[PDB]
Amino acid sequence: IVGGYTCGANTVPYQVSLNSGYHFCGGSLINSQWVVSAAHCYKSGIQVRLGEDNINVVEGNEQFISASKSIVHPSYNSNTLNNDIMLIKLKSAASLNSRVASISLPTSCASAGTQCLISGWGNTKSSGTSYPDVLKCLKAPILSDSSCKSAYPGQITSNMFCAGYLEGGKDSCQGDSGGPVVCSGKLQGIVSWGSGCAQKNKPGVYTKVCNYVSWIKQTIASN
């Protein structure tokens, strides 16, 4: 997260870190057994880390649970990033509490102008590289479909939306991949892609979660 703020320990209780020897992506806890992330975060050997603030220190609220199964969306295209969503099932159920909690799925899509919270352990620099230990947060509005398409000609599908600031300076970044965009207490987006980070006229692009609720629910119901 570039241009954000320190969230505060465990204030984003649905935020997970995906770990394969190191943090490599975010995700969102959606029930005691399932996490939603980006398809571009797929790899084998994932341990889901819940209850994290400092990802380099065991602070006492963590739960570390290995994945038993990952399901990349059937229509994910890794060249265009269309349908950039994946589900991860935990080998055991997380113990839910005030600091480890699921985030509700949307019942309706969110409109341009809606304020959202984007979070993660990604790079905090738009030029150069610095990776934080503690969770970073950014409040950002959803941008209009027309401004999103104008920013990224030929690339924005109906499964994507932009959020952030056309002036630059505030954005998600590398390592925030797969993490949440939460608006009014609902998971509306997944950190998906963009041209650099925090660049003028290049806002972040996010998977449009509301399009996937039926797939998420039916997948959970049979897996």
Ligand X SMILES: Cc1[nH]c2ccccc2c1CCN
* Residue ranges of the binding site: 52, 54, 57, 62, 171-172, 174-175, 177
Binding string to Ca ion for residues 42 to 61, with x set by CB under 5 A, is what?
A: ----------x-x----x--
174 interface partner picked from ligand X, Ca ion, none, CB below 5 to 8 A per type: ligand X
Q: Which is nearer to Ca ion, 59 or 145 (CB)?
A: 59
Residues 181 to 200: which contact ligand X by CB under 6 A? Answer: 191-194, 196-197
Q: Does 174 bind ligand X (CB under 6 A)?
A: yes
Q: Does 80 bind ligand X (CB under 6 A)?
A: no
Q: E strands, 73-203, where?
A: 86-90, 115-120, 136-141, 160-163, 180-183, 186-193
Q: Are strands 5-6 and 180-183 parallel, antiparallel or unpaired?
A: unpaired
Smallest gap from Cβ 5 to ligand X, in A, equals: 17
Active site (catalytic) residues:
40, 84, 177
Give the residue from 178, 174, 221, 217 showing the smallest Cα distance to 198. Answer: 174
Q: Does 106 bind ligand X (CB under 6 A)?
A: no
How are strands ordered across the β-sheet holding 180-183?
5-6, 136-141, 115-120, 180-183, 186-193, 204-208, 160-163
Q: Where are the alpha helices (DSSP H) in the chain?
A: 145-151, 213-222
Binding string to ligand X for residues 153 to 172, with x set by CB under 6 A, is what?
A: ------------------xx
**Rounded distance between C-alpha atoms, residue 3 and residue 102, angstroms:** 26
Residue of 204, 208, 209, 212 that binds ligand X (CB under 6 A): 204
**Rounded distance between C-alpha atoms, residue 164 and residue 142, angstroms:** 7
Smallest gap from Cβ 51 to Ca ion, in A, equals: 8
Smallest gap from Cβ 111 to ligand X, in A, equals: 21
Q: Which is nearer to ligand X, 19 or 33 (CB)?
A: 19
- Backbone phi, psi, residue 202, to 5°: -130, 75
Per CB under 6 A, residues contacting ligand X are 171-174, 176-177, 191-194, 196-197, 204
